[PDB]
Amino acid sequence: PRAKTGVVRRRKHKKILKLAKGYWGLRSKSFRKARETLFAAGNYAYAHRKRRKRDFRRLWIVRINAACRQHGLNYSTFIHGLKKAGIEVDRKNLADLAVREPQVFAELVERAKAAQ
Amino acid sequence: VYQIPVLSPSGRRELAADLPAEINPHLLWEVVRWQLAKRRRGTASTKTRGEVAYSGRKIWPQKHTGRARHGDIGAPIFVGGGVVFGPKPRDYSYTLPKKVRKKGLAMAVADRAREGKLLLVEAFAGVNGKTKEFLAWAKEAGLDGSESVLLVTGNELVRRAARNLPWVVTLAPEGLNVYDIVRTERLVMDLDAWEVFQNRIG
Amino acid sequence: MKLSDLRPNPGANKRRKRVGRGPGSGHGKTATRGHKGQKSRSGGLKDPRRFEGGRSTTLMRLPKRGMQGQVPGEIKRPRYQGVNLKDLARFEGEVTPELLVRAGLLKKGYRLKILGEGEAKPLKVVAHAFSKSALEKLKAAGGEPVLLE
Amino acid sequence: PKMKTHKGAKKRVKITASGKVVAMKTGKRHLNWQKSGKEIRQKGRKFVLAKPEAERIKLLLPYE
RNA sequence: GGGCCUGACUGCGAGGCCUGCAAGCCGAGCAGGGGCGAAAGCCGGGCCUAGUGAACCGGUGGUCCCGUGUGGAAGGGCCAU
RNA sequence: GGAUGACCCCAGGCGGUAGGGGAGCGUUCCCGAUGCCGAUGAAGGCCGACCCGCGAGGGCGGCUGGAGGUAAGGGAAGUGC
RNA sequence: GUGGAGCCUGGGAGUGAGGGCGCGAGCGAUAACGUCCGCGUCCGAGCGCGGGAACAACCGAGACCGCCAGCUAAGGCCCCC
RNA sequence: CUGUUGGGAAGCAGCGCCAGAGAGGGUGAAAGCCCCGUAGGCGAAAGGUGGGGGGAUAGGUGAGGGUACCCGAGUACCCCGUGGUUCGUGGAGCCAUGGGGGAAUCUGGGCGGACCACCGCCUAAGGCUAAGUACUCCGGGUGACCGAUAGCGCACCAGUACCGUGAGGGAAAGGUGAAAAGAACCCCGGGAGGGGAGUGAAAUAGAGCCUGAAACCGUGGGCUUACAAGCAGUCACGGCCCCGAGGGGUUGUGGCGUGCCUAUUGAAGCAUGAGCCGGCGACUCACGGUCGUGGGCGAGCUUAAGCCGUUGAGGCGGAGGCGUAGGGAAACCGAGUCCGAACAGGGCGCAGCGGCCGCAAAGUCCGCGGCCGUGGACCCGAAACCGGGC
RNA sequence: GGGGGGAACCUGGGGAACUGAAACAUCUCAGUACCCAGAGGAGAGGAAAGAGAAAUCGACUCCCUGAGUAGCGGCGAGCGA
Ligand SMILES: NC(=[NH2+])NCCC[C@H](N)C(=O)O
Ligand SMILES: [Mg+2]
Ligand SMILES: [Mg+2]
Ligand SMILES: [Mg+2]
Ligand SMILES: [Mg+2]
Ligand SMILES: [Mg+2]
Ligand SMILES: [Mg+2]
Ligand SMILES: [Mg+2]
Ligand SMILES: [Mg+2]
Ligand SMILES: [Mg+2]
Ligand SMILES: [Mg+2]
Ligand SMILES: [Mg+2]
Ligand SMILES: [Mg+2]
Ligand SMILES: [Mg+2]
Ligand SMILES: [Mg+2]
Ligand SMILES: [Mg+2]
Ligand SMILES: [Mg+2]
Ligand SMILES: [Mg+2]
Ligand SMILES: [Mg+2]
Ligand SMILES: [Mg+2]
Ligand SMILES: [Mg+2]
Ligand SMILES: [Mg+2]
Ligand SMILES: [Mg+2]
Ligand SMILES: [Mg+2]
Ligand SMILES: [Mg+2]
Ligand SMILES: [Mg+2]
Ligand SMILES: [Mg+2]
Ligand SMILES: [Mg+2]
Ligand SMILES: [Mg+2]
Ligand SMILES: [Mg+2]
Ligand SMILES: [Mg+2]
Ligand SMILES: [Mg+2]
Ligand SMILES: [Mg+2]
Ligand SMILES: [Mg+2]
Ligand SMILES: [Mg+2]
Ligand SMILES: [Mg+2]
Ligand SMILES: [Mg+2]
Ligand SMILES: [Mg+2]
Ligand SMILES: [Mg+2]
Ligand SMILES: [Mg+2]
Ligand SMILES: [Mg+2]
Ligand SMILES: [Mg+2]
Ligand SMILES: [Mg+2]
Ligand SMILES: [Mg+2]
Ligand SMILES: [Mg+2]
Ligand SMILES: [Mg+2]
Ligand SMILES: [Mg+2]
Ligand SMILES: [Mg+2]
Ligand SMILES: [Mg+2]
Ligand SMILES: [Mg+2]
Ligand SMILES: [Mg+2]
Ligand SMILES: [Mg+2]
Ligand SMILES: [Mg+2]
Ligand SMILES: [Mg+2]
Ligand SMILES: [Mg+2]
Ligand SMILES: [Mg+2]
Ligand SMILES: [Mg+2]
Ligand SMILES: [Mg+2]
Ligand SMILES: [Mg+2]
Ligand SMILES: [Mg+2]
Ligand SMILES: [Mg+2]
Ligand SMILES: [Mg+2]
Ligand SMILES: [Mg+2]
Ligand SMILES: [Mg+2]
Ligand SMILES: [Mg+2]
Ligand SMILES: [Mg+2]
Ligand SMILES: [Mg+2]
Ligand SMILES: [Mg+2]
Ligand SMILES: [Mg+2]
Ligand SMILES: [Mg+2]
Ligand SMILES: [Mg+2]
Ligand SMILES: [Mg+2]
Ligand SMILES: [Mg+2]
Ligand SMILES: [Mg+2]
Ligand SMILES: [Mg+2]
Ligand SMILES: [Mg+2]
Ligand SMILES: [Mg+2]
Ligand SMILES: [Mg+2]
Ligand SMILES: [Mg+2]
Ligand SMILES: [Mg+2]
Ligand SMILES: [Mg+2]
Ligand SMILES: [Mg+2]
Ligand SMILES: [Mg+2]
Ligand SMILES: [Mg+2]
Ligand SMILES: [Mg+2]
Ligand SMILES: [Mg+2]
Ligand SMILES: [Mg+2]
Ligand SMILES: [Mg+2]
Ligand SMILES: [Mg+2]
Ligand SMILES: [Mg+2]
Ligand SMILES: [Mg+2]
Ligand SMILES: [Mg+2]
Ligand SMILES: [Mg+2]
Ligand SMILES: [Mg+2]
Ligand SMILES: [Mg+2]
Ligand SMILES: [Mg+2]
Ligand SMILES: [Mg+2]
Ligand SMILES: [Mg+2]
Ligand SMILES: [Mg+2]
Ligand SMILES: [Mg+2]
Ligand SMILES: [Mg+2]
Ligand SMILES: [Mg+2]
Ligand SMILES: [Mg+2]
Ligand SMILES: [Mg+2]
Ligand SMILES: [Mg+2]
Ligand SMILES: [Mg+2]
Ligand SMILES: [Mg+2]
Ligand SMILES: [Mg+2]
Ligand SMILES: [Mg+2]
Ligand SMILES: [Mg+2]
Ligand SMILES: [Mg+2]
Ligand SMILES: [Mg+2]
Ligand SMILES: [Mg+2]
Ligand SMILES: [Mg+2]
Ligand SMILES: [Mg+2]
Ligand SMILES: [Mg+2]
Ligand SMILES: [Mg+2]
Ligand SMILES: [Mg+2]
Ligand SMILES: [Mg+2]
Ligand SMILES: [Mg+2]
Ligand SMILES: [Mg+2]
Ligand SMILES: [Mg+2]
Ligand SMILES: [Mg+2]
Ligand SMILES: [Mg+2]
Ligand SMILES: [Mg+2]
Ligand SMILES: [Mg+2]
Ligand SMILES: [Mg+2]
Ligand SMILES: [Mg+2]
Ligand SMILES: [Mg+2]
Ligand SMILES: [Mg+2]
Ligand SMILES: [Mg+2]
Ligand SMILES: [Mg+2]
Ligand SMILES: [Mg+2]
Ligand SMILES: [Mg+2]
Ligand SMILES: [Mg+2]
Ligand SMILES: [Mg+2]
Ligand SMILES: [Mg+2]
Ligand SMILES: [Mg+2]
Ligand SMILES: [Mg+2]
Ligand SMILES: [Mg+2]
Ligand SMILES: [Mg+2]
Ligand SMILES: [Mg+2]
Ligand SMILES: [Mg+2]
Ligand SMILES: [Mg+2]
Ligand SMILES: [Mg+2]
Ligand SMILES: [Mg+2]
Ligand SMILES: [Mg+2]
Ligand SMILES: [Mg+2]
Ligand SMILES: [Mg+2]
Ligand SMILES: [Mg+2]
Ligand SMILES: [Mg+2]
Ligand SMILES: [Mg+2]
Ligand SMILES: [Mg+2]
Ligand SMILES: [Mg+2]
Ligand SMILES: [Mg+2]
Ligand SMILES: [Mg+2]
Ligand SMILES: [Mg+2]
Ligand SMILES: [Mg+2]
Ligand SMILES: [Mg+2]
Ligand SMILES: [Mg+2]
Ligand SMILES: [Mg+2]
Ligand SMILES: [Mg+2]
Ligand SMILES: [Mg+2]
Ligand SMILES: [Mg+2]
Ligand SMILES: [Mg+2]
Ligand SMILES: [Mg+2]
Ligand SMILES: [Mg+2]
Ligand SMILES: [Mg+2]
Ligand SMILES: [Mg+2]
Ligand SMILES: [Mg+2]
Ligand SMILES: [Mg+2]
Ligand SMILES: [Mg+2]
Ligand SMILES: [Mg+2]
Ligand SMILES: [Mg+2]
Ligand SMILES: [Mg+2]
Ligand SMILES: [Mg+2]
Ligand SMILES: [Mg+2]
Ligand SMILES: [Mg+2]
Ligand SMILES: [Mg+2]
Ligand SMILES: [Mg+2]
Ligand SMILES: [Mg+2]
Ligand SMILES: [Mg+2]
Ligand SMILES: [Mg+2]
Ligand SMILES: [Mg+2]
Ligand SMILES: [Mg+2]
Ligand SMILES: [Mg+2]
Ligand SMILES: [Mg+2]
Ligand SMILES: [Mg+2]
Ligand SMILES: [Mg+2]
Ligand SMILES: [Mg+2]
Ligand SMILES: [Mg+2]
Ligand SMILES: [Mg+2]
Ligand SMILES: [Mg+2]
Ligand SMILES: [Mg+2]
Ligand SMILES: [Mg+2]
Ligand SMILES: [Mg+2]
Ligand SMILES: [Mg+2]
Ligand SMILES: [Mg+2]
Ligand SMILES: [Mg+2]
Ligand SMILES: [Mg+2]
Ligand SMILES: [Mg+2]
Ligand SMILES: [Mg+2]
Ligand SMILES: [Mg+2]
Ligand SMILES: [Mg+2]
Ligand SMILES: [Mg+2]
Ligand SMILES: [Mg+2]
Ligand SMILES: [Mg+2]
Ligand SMILES: [Mg+2]
Ligand SMILES: [Mg+2]
Ligand SMILES: [Mg+2]
Ligand SMILES: [Mg+2]
Ligand SMILES: [Mg+2]
Ligand SMILES: [Mg+2]
Ligand SMILES: [Mg+2]
Ligand SMILES: [Mg+2]
Ligand SMILES: [Mg+2]
Ligand SMILES: [Mg+2]
Ligand SMILES: [Mg+2]
Ligand SMILES: [Mg+2]
Ligand SMILES: [Mg+2]
Ligand SMILES: [Mg+2]
Ligand SMILES: [Mg+2]
Ligand SMILES: [Mg+2]
Ligand SMILES: [Mg+2]
Ligand SMILES: [Mg+2]
Ligand SMILES: [Mg+2]
Ligand SMILES: [Mg+2]
Ligand SMILES: [Mg+2]
Ligand SMILES: [Mg+2]
Ligand SMILES: [Mg+2]
Ligand SMILES: [Mg+2]
Ligand SMILES: [Mg+2]
Ligand SMILES: [Mg+2]
Ligand SMILES: [Mg+2]
Ligand SMILES: [Mg+2]
Ligand SMILES: [Mg+2]
Ligand SMILES: [Mg+2]
Ligand SMILES: [Mg+2]
Ligand SMILES: [Mg+2]
Ligand SMILES: [Mg+2]
Ligand SMILES: [Mg+2]
Ligand SMILES: [Mg+2]
Ligand SMILES: [Mg+2]
Ligand SMILES: [Mg+2]
Ligand SMILES: [Mg+2]
Ligand SMILES: [Mg+2]
Ligand SMILES: [Mg+2]
Ligand SMILES: [Mg+2]
Ligand SMILES: [Mg+2]
Ligand SMILES: [Mg+2]
Ligand SMILES: [Mg+2]
Ligand SMILES: [Mg+2]
Ligand SMILES: [Mg+2]
Ligand SMILES: [Mg+2]
Ligand SMILES: [Mg+2]
Ligand SMILES: [Mg+2]
Ligand SMILES: [Mg+2]
Ligand SMILES: [Mg+2]
Ligand SMILES: [Mg+2]
Ligand SMILES: [Mg+2]
Ligand SMILES: [Mg+2]
Ligand SMILES: [Mg+2]
Ligand SMILES: [Mg+2]
Ligand SMILES: [Mg+2]
Ligand SMILES: [Mg+2]
Ligand SMILES: [Mg+2]
Ligand SMILES: [Mg+2]
Ligand SMILES: [Mg+2]
Ligand SMILES: [Mg+2]
Ligand SMILES: [Mg+2]
Ligand SMILES: [Mg+2]
Ligand SMILES: [Mg+2]
Ligand SMILES: [Mg+2]
Ligand SMILES: [Mg+2]
Ligand SMILES: [Mg+2]
Ligand SMILES: [Mg+2]
Ligand SMILES: [Mg+2]
Ligand SMILES: [Mg+2]
Ligand SMILES: [Mg+2]
Ligand SMILES: [Mg+2]
Ligand SMILES: [Mg+2]
Ligand SMILES: [Mg+2]
Ligand SMILES: [Mg+2]
Ligand SMILES: [Mg+2]
Ligand SMILES: [Mg+2]
Ligand SMILES: [Mg+2]
Ligand SMILES: [Mg+2]
Ligand SMILES: [Mg+2]
Ligand SMILES: [Mg+2]
Ligand SMILES: [Mg+2]
Ligand SMILES: [Mg+2]
Ligand SMILES: [Mg+2]
Ligand SMILES: [Mg+2]
Ligand SMILES: [Mg+2]
Ligand SMILES: [Mg+2]
Ligand SMILES: [Mg+2]
Ligand SMILES: [Mg+2]
């Protein structure tokens, strides 16, 4: 018996073109350019999932640094002090305290100054 | 080994049969594959790039046209050209070993015997060729058409009367075959067919 | 047992290897042929059993030996097939060429020669020849060697 | 169609009971005046072909 | 340097070196019949590593294995070159 | 572990071209099928932010369409761009 | 020394254009992103990740998946960062 | 047959009936019983056939003994040159014959692979001869055959249109609906086209007609954009719009970021290929081999062509094949054998698990799978070579 | 009585090359493709101046097998009773 293409390729192409919705020009209209764009997009998302963890740690550290310098020490002294005081609140929560609970963050600065 | 109900004007007697104890499903599958393959027509066919109607002329020069190079238009790259590795007329039959067929036959009957779905009969009372007659005989025989039946008898008149029934498959004893046995929920043979069956599996 | 229960045993019907059907299969593109060269081509190599890339082949450098024959061919002569005493153990009474041919021991068109592997039986054994030891063993066992011509 | 026996092999080689391939040693067809008795004598024996070459030759003899 | 000599053996060959193959290389020991030596022993060419060429086809000497109905023969095989 | 992939627990491996092996998805056709799904709407088309699946895919829902389609389990290939 | 170790038999391959770097030589001119070998390495196939401004093979390190958690490597900590 | 939903019943429901017929195709949808059929039967005045039956006719028919008349001529035969055969000059016979020479009539002649002898086989140089075999323009039956880029080149007015001086080359192009009920009439328009009306179950089924994807073009709407550096995405946050601790759309800013494929030591590469979309497009099949694997049987395993049956039924058939012994160039011997003087040494060979019973196995058969040989053998592509024509 | 036609099949008279031999000439492809003459529903062949070892068989044709055997072969590729 013969098995022609039939419906199979159109359905395969429509799955790809649906994923490429929103892309520019033929990148969302042509099956070939959509798939090439999707190849890059998939690698980017994987790479940026990793990169997002670093991006947010940088931001925390910058905010933590500025809150520290209002109390007369720098970030790197503040982190060492927390290490010697045994405090393990992470940078996501330290940065939130720096903005939302300045009293609590100040007492943390106190503990860090005292630990050295 | 097996106790087989017989249907008689003198009541449901019992006959003993030396049917195999072990039903081997893979082997039964091998017989059916053979039965279904050897009946194939093998008439699918296509045309090669040599058998298609076009000329062997090179459609345009090798070089300097700006097109891809080509020879004749029967090449399978062309719409309307030959088929690459299409079906050709083919013989699907093969010689399954005789002992596998014979032993397959016995296992298919033995499987029906072990379910209680095998029934032997001495005669078919008033079955003289008419469907309504075989129906009346079947009713008393316990064959109400709720189960498909493979009817194996040499009585030509009995086969003619039963054969139009959607739930009956009819065979002469020399035609007993495992595909037809396994196709049907019940097995009914007269004592004569039961005997040519025994001669075959011996 | 019905048709929807008929199944081959595991491994009785394996799927084929389909090449040139896509990256995920592991056999896409070059279709397990590697890259270029004569072997990748449709039509492929010269017979690997013989050809050696142009050098004189392993086989052709070895010497011929023996009678190869001449036209008009094989000289017709009587041929013998050995049958051991052990193979005769199944028989009783009188074993002969025609009988051993039936049981699948002797091949048609061959004269019978009894050889001496195994134990002789008290049998009348008709044959075209006997090894020295087959004679010894058959006499000593009470059997009777009858020698045809 | 059915394979053809290679007759160059059939004239040079034999398959033994266990499937080894045995051939006559090379090198004493001629130029023998200055070869020692040891060379002539040992070149008159059969030898067992190395496994890779023996497998190829056996494929050439499908009906032995 | 001299004496006697032909082992510059025949039939084999445990075991190895080398090595893709095919080749190449070393070889104790047993038998036959020898050489030299009182003997122990040595001798299967040459202090050693180059001095060489697989097959196919054909010549020659031997062998007396095959011999196309049979006996021969033709022509082959085998051993040596 | 329990007893034979029932599932759980602990540990370890899991970059990859040529290439070797394994397990699956889907397409056409046959048995299953004188069956079963179907005008209270087949196939195909167009949607979906929902469900299942690692994935290839499979469901389900709405719209279109207007007459076909075809299960568990197996079989065969003009089988996936 | 229990390792995606080793050995045996067999089925299937692909490869037989390498390249950079370190070290050891030859060739070259104590030239070449030169060339030809040896030992090793990486790229090839890790054009995946951090550093080196950018950059296959230099330094760091062998990416199963997820996390808006933590510790480090080379390299960094005036601003871009 | 009735009811019922429906444009329509064959669907569903009630109650029946036929069947040597429940193959299949129609009918407004899905029908054994409405139609065409199917099973089972029946049928030729005329022409054709008639291999079967019957009848003619042609033709066919003894034994000794003697006689030695006849028994296929430029033939046999030999030589030369070639062909045929498995035979390529080979030890080269046989069969055929272009050249030369050239018989005999059975006590004649040819053959059994040079030749000779022996022993046999056959009767050359005249002719005919059914059947079993091949093929498929034609008709029919049937498909794990195609379904409009497929299947014949052609489903259709095709060997046409068109191309070529000619030989020759050689397309595309199927589908309204159940029924034409194929849209009277009015309105804008020169017409085309449309808007109403009307038909229809349906009219984006309206003839440029089933379904009606994609590229491509346009109208409307949401978000967004004129200080901005870009393989066009991705991660984050915010704004707006939409659907109702959530999600979809959009993208302002910030971070990161060198297309795909091919070929390469190495490509984003300024190296190859691709305008975009849709459809067609490349590892197969037969036979043999080798190994693996699922079964059958096991010192055995297995049939081939056929024959009989069946009409999607299987069986019969042992001729033959592989295996059961090897070694040797062979004669030959044989669990051995070959080299050899060897009784030497060496090469190549030789030897199940349980309690008579299971089980397992040599081997072999069939299925499946990898790979090999033979074929075009994964697909496309030369320049060329040859034949017959134009 | 002939003439001319007929898809394929058949017989006879002539008869390539690419290709294969990983070059090529013998060899192969192949007495194939093709040209020509003729036959007919078939055609050819056919009633032993046979076979070839069986003290044997008994026209011819065709299928299976014998058998990729016997042999043939730049004893190569291959060919093949
Ligand atoms: N006795 C029988 N074979 N019955 C078979 C039923 C019908 C079958 N199709 C035939 O043609 O006969
Ligand atoms: Mg396709
Ligand atoms: Mg299609
Ligand atoms: Mg498609
Ligand atoms: Mg696709
Ligand atoms: Mg679709
Ligand atoms: Mg799809
Ligand atoms: Mg967008
Ligand atoms: Mg665009
Ligand atoms: Mg645009
Ligand atoms: Mg578009
Ligand atoms: Mg993706
Ligand atoms: Mg990630
Ligand atoms: Mg990353
Ligand atoms: Mg990290
Ligand atoms: Mg400070
Ligand atoms: Mg720290
Ligand atoms: Mg910490
Ligand atoms: Mg078929
Ligand atoms: Mg075709
Ligand atoms: Mg065809
Ligand atoms: Mg063609
Ligand atoms: Mg052609
Ligand atoms: Mg053609
Ligand atoms: Mg034509
Ligand atoms: Mg043509
Ligand atoms: Mg042509
Ligand atoms: Mg041409
Ligand atoms: Mg042409
Ligand atoms: Mg060009
Ligand atoms: Mg141009
Ligand atoms: Mg162009
Ligand atoms: Mg082109
Ligand atoms: Mg072009
Ligand atoms: Mg061209
Ligand atoms: Mg072409
Ligand atoms: Mg062509
Ligand atoms: Mg063509
Ligand atoms: Mg075309
Ligand atoms: Mg076609
Ligand atoms: Mg066409
Ligand atoms: Mg066509
Ligand atoms: Mg094709
Ligand atoms: Mg092809
Ligand atoms: Mg082709
Ligand atoms: Mg056929
Ligand atoms: Mg097959
Ligand atoms: Mg067959
Ligand atoms: Mg049998
Ligand atoms: Mg029936
Ligand atoms: Mg039926
Ligand atoms: Mg039934
Ligand atoms: Mg039936
Ligand atoms: Mg398969
Ligand atoms: Mg296959
Ligand atoms: Mg697989
Ligand atoms: Mg597949
Ligand atoms: Mg794939
Ligand atoms: Mg694989
Ligand atoms: Mg791979
Ligand atoms: Mg590719
Ligand atoms: Mg491979
Ligand atoms: Mg492969
Ligand atoms: Mg390969
Ligand atoms: Mg390459
Ligand atoms: Mg390569
Ligand atoms: Mg390539
Ligand atoms: Mg290469
Ligand atoms: Mg190449
Ligand atoms: Mg290669
Ligand atoms: Mg090709
Ligand atoms: Mg080639
Ligand atoms: Mg050379
Ligand atoms: Mg021979
Ligand atoms: Mg002959
Ligand atoms: Mg006795
Ligand atoms: Mg040879
Ligand atoms: Mg030699
Ligand atoms: Mg010699
Ligand atoms: Mg010689
Ligand atoms: Mg010397
Ligand atoms: Mg010597
Ligand atoms: Mg010498
Ligand atoms: Mg010697
Ligand atoms: Mg054989
Ligand atoms: Mg001296
Ligand atoms: Mg001296
Ligand atoms: Mg002396
Ligand atoms: Mg040794
Ligand atoms: Mg060696
Ligand atoms: Mg040397
Ligand atoms: Mg001595
Ligand atoms: Mg001595
Ligand atoms: Mg001595
Ligand atoms: Mg002395
Ligand atoms: Mg001495
Ligand atoms: Mg010595
Ligand atoms: Mg010297
Ligand atoms: Mg000296
Ligand atoms: Mg020297
Ligand atoms: Mg030498
Ligand atoms: Mg030589
Ligand atoms: Mg040669
Ligand atoms: Mg010779
Ligand atoms: Mg001689
Ligand atoms: Mg003799
Ligand atoms: Mg003779
Ligand atoms: Mg004599
Ligand atoms: Mg003699
Ligand atoms: Mg003489
Ligand atoms: Mg002689
Ligand atoms: Mg010699
Ligand atoms: Mg775990
Ligand atoms: Mg991996
Ligand atoms: Mg695996
Ligand atoms: Mg599947
Ligand atoms: Mg599935
Ligand atoms: Mg698919
Ligand atoms: Mg079909
Ligand atoms: Mg059906
Ligand atoms: Mg159906
Ligand atoms: Mg229903
Ligand atoms: Mg309706
Ligand atoms: Mg609807
Ligand atoms: Mg479907
Ligand atoms: Mg379909
Ligand atoms: Mg879906
Ligand atoms: Mg739908
Ligand atoms: Mg509708
Ligand atoms: Mg229908
Ligand atoms: Mg189905
Ligand atoms: Mg299924
Ligand atoms: Mg089945
Ligand atoms: Mg098929
Ligand atoms: Mg295809
Ligand atoms: Mg490993
Ligand atoms: Mg490894
Ligand atoms: Mg493989
Ligand atoms: Mg290779
Ligand atoms: Mg290579
Ligand atoms: Mg090379
Ligand atoms: Mg190289
Ligand atoms: Mg290179
Ligand atoms: Mg190198
Ligand atoms: Mg390397
Ligand atoms: Mg570089
Ligand atoms: Mg270096
Ligand atoms: Mg240094
Ligand atoms: Mg250096
Ligand atoms: Mg050096
Ligand atoms: Mg300088
Ligand atoms: Mg370099
Ligand atoms: Mg340098
Ligand atoms: Mg240098
Ligand atoms: Mg290196
Ligand atoms: Mg590479
Ligand atoms: Mg690296
Ligand atoms: Mg690596
Ligand atoms: Mg890469
Ligand atoms: Mg990067
Ligand atoms: Mg880097
Ligand atoms: Mg960097
Ligand atoms: Mg940087
Ligand atoms: Mg890197
Ligand atoms: Mg890893
Ligand atoms: Mg830290
Ligand atoms: Mg550091
Ligand atoms: Mg810096
Ligand atoms: Mg900073
Ligand atoms: Mg109504
Ligand atoms: Mg009604
Ligand atoms: Mg009803
Ligand atoms: Mg019927
Ligand atoms: Mg119907
Ligand atoms: Mg029907
Ligand atoms: Mg129905
Ligand atoms: Mg239906
Ligand atoms: Mg109907
Ligand atoms: Mg009828
Ligand atoms: Mg009728
Ligand atoms: Mg007379
Ligand atoms: Mg008389
Ligand atoms: Mg006379
Ligand atoms: Mg005469
Ligand atoms: Mg005359
Ligand atoms: Mg002549
Ligand atoms: Mg000739
Ligand atoms: Mg001749
Ligand atoms: Mg010769
Ligand atoms: Mg001759
Ligand atoms: Mg006479
Ligand atoms: Mg005479
Ligand atoms: Mg004659
Ligand atoms: Mg003569
Ligand atoms: Mg003669
Ligand atoms: Mg004769
Ligand atoms: Mg003779
Ligand atoms: Mg005579
Ligand atoms: Mg004769
Ligand atoms: Mg007749
Ligand atoms: Mg005739
Ligand atoms: Mg005839
Ligand atoms: Mg016919
Ligand atoms: Mg027809
Ligand atoms: Mg179809
Ligand atoms: Mg159809
Ligand atoms: Mg069309
Ligand atoms: Mg067409
Ligand atoms: Mg269509
Ligand atoms: Mg037609
Ligand atoms: Mg037309
Ligand atoms: Mg012109
Ligand atoms: Mg014209
Ligand atoms: Mg033309
Ligand atoms: Mg057309
Ligand atoms: Mg119409
Ligand atoms: Mg219509
Ligand atoms: Mg109007
Ligand atoms: Mg008007
Ligand atoms: Mg007007
Ligand atoms: Mg007007
Ligand atoms: Mg109008
Ligand atoms: Mg209007
Ligand atoms: Mg209306
Ligand atoms: Mg309606
Ligand atoms: Mg519509
Ligand atoms: Mg419509
Ligand atoms: Mg329709
Ligand atoms: Mg439409
Ligand atoms: Mg439209
Ligand atoms: Mg717009
Ligand atoms: Mg500015
Ligand atoms: Mg602005
Ligand atoms: Mg961005
Ligand atoms: Mg952020
Ligand atoms: Mg939102
Ligand atoms: Mg957003
Ligand atoms: Mg870029
Ligand atoms: Mg780059
Ligand atoms: Mg791609
Ligand atoms: Mg490319
Ligand atoms: Mg390139
Ligand atoms: Mg290049
Ligand atoms: Mg380059
Ligand atoms: Mg670029
Ligand atoms: Mg560019
Ligand atoms: Mg360029
Ligand atoms: Mg480019
Ligand atoms: Mg290029
Ligand atoms: Mg273009
Ligand atoms: Mg486009
Ligand atoms: Mg496409
Ligand atoms: Mg394959
Ligand atoms: Mg094929
Ligand atoms: Mg095949
Ligand atoms: Mg196989
Ligand atoms: Mg097998
Ligand atoms: Mg069996
Ligand atoms: Mg067994
Ligand atoms: Mg055979
Ligand atoms: Mg055997
Ligand atoms: Mg032998
Ligand atoms: Mg001797
Ligand atoms: Mg021995
Ligand atoms: Mg031994
Ligand atoms: Mg077995
Ligand atoms: Mg292989
Ligand atoms: Mg071919
Ligand atoms: Mg092919
Ligand atoms: Mg192939
Ligand atoms: Mg030209
Ligand atoms: Mg030429
Ligand atoms: Mg030429
Ligand atoms: Mg011409
Ligand atoms: Mg004429
Ligand atoms: Mg004429
Ligand atoms: Mg005529
Ligand atoms: Mg001829
Ligand atoms: Mg010519
Ligand atoms: Mg030629
Ligand atoms: Mg050819
Ligand atoms: Mg060819
Ligand atoms: Mg070849
Ligand atoms: Mg050639
Ligand atoms: Mg070549
Ligand atoms: Mg050439
Ligand atoms: Mg020829
Ligand atoms: Mg001819
Ligand atoms: Mg032809
Ligand atoms: Mg003529
Ligand atoms: Mg004519
Ligand atoms: Mg006829
Ligand atoms: Mg005739
Ligand atoms: Mg005649
Ligand atoms: Mg006569
Ligand atoms: Mg045989
Ligand atoms: Mg020939």
PDB file of N, CA and C in Angstrom, chain D residues 49-52:
ATOM      1  N   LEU D  49      45.777 -20.394   7.900  1.00  0.00           N
ATOM      2  CA  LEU D  49      45.753 -18.972   7.588  1.00  0.00           C
ATOM      3  C   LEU D  49      45.280 -18.175   8.792  1.00  0.00           C
ATOM      4  N   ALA D  50      45.880 -17.002   8.973  1.00  0.00           N
ATOM      5  CA  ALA D  50      45.435 -16.062   9.990  1.00  0.00           C
ATOM      6  C   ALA D  50      43.932 -15.848   9.907  1.00  0.00           C
ATOM      7  N   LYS D  51      43.310 -15.681  11.075  1.00  0.00           N
ATOM      8  CA  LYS D  51      41.854 -15.574  11.190  1.00  0.00           C
ATOM      9  C   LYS D  51      41.211 -14.544  10.259  1.00  0.00           C
ATOM     10  N   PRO D  52      41.681 -13.295  10.161  1.00  0.00           N
ATOM     11  CA  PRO D  52      40.954 -12.346   9.294  1.00  0.00           C
ATOM     12  C   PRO D  52      40.900 -12.808   7.845  1.00  0.00           C
TER      13      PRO D  52
END
